[PDB]
Amino acid sequence: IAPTMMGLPIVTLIIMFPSLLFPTPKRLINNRTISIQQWLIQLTSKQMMAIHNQKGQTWSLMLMSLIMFIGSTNILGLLPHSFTPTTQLSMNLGMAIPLWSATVFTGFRYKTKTSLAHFLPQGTPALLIPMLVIIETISLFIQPVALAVRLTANITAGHLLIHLIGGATLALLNINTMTAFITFTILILLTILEFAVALIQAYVFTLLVSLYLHD
Amino acid sequence: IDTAAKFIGAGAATVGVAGSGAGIGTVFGSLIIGYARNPSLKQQLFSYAILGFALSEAMGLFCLMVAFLILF
Amino acid sequence: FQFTGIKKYFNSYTLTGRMNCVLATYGGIALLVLYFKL
């Protein structure tokens, strides 16, 4: 009967915190703790730049920062009392709309006629053309909200499940075997909750696919 | 009445997670036939299987979040 | 003097990236609608 609370403290200090977790030394040889960060950055950058292979690869140097930021913010939430900034819908809403708008306006800046012609899937039955067009434009307008929700909802749900099962364990003053089993379930869930990085990958990869489709 | 609505709405909403269970079952099953046809388990065969499991689990937990909101 | 570090990237990708004005307009309209509810 404990009310879940994703409270709103002074956001700026919490949000800026993951940035300080990555130092950038100006040395030929790094500090064997930024080195792993650099290697991960290169490994992910290769995967992200493989698909584009265009002049839009300039966007990749910002998408790397995007994926690093989202991953750092979401991975830090697994701590006992950490407040996930991505739990709040505000910042993810403020991230999904501008980037989708950037993708569509970049598409409309160069080869604009063909960018709008991407609605045409090279012909398709003419009898159902208006239905297909309205479906695809409604999907395109859905895409930003979809991108925001597919991050916010499950990021909140992980913490919600952790809180629920933890409260169940704490309230379980009964047979200790059941308590131990529920604690094992908790640890298994938290190991699964570490897959929030896969959510970062999904978000950034969907954004990359949209940008590549429109550019 | 309102508490009864909370209970019935939660009981309904939690039934929507069954489709995500079917999806994770389907993808993890397809994992095994992909492995059988091509013994490259450590590769994208298992990487994208994990990706699909995470995506469907997201589709299920993002559903049960509504039930959690209804209950509280 | 951190502006010059990413000044080229700023106007390089914000030609369409700096459309956060749409986000600000949407947020302001939503806040006005909620204040009408409020």
Partner: peptide
């Protein structure tokens, strides 16, 4: 609990984006 308001949460993220991209621009392969 439920997200409301949406004023300053969506404002600090742009500054953090600036900071993160400036930081990672120094990173090189």
């Amino acid at each position: 609990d439920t997200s409301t308001w949406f004023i300053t949460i969506t404002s600090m993220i742009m500054t953090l984006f600036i900071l993160f991209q400036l930081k990672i621009s120094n990173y090189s392969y």
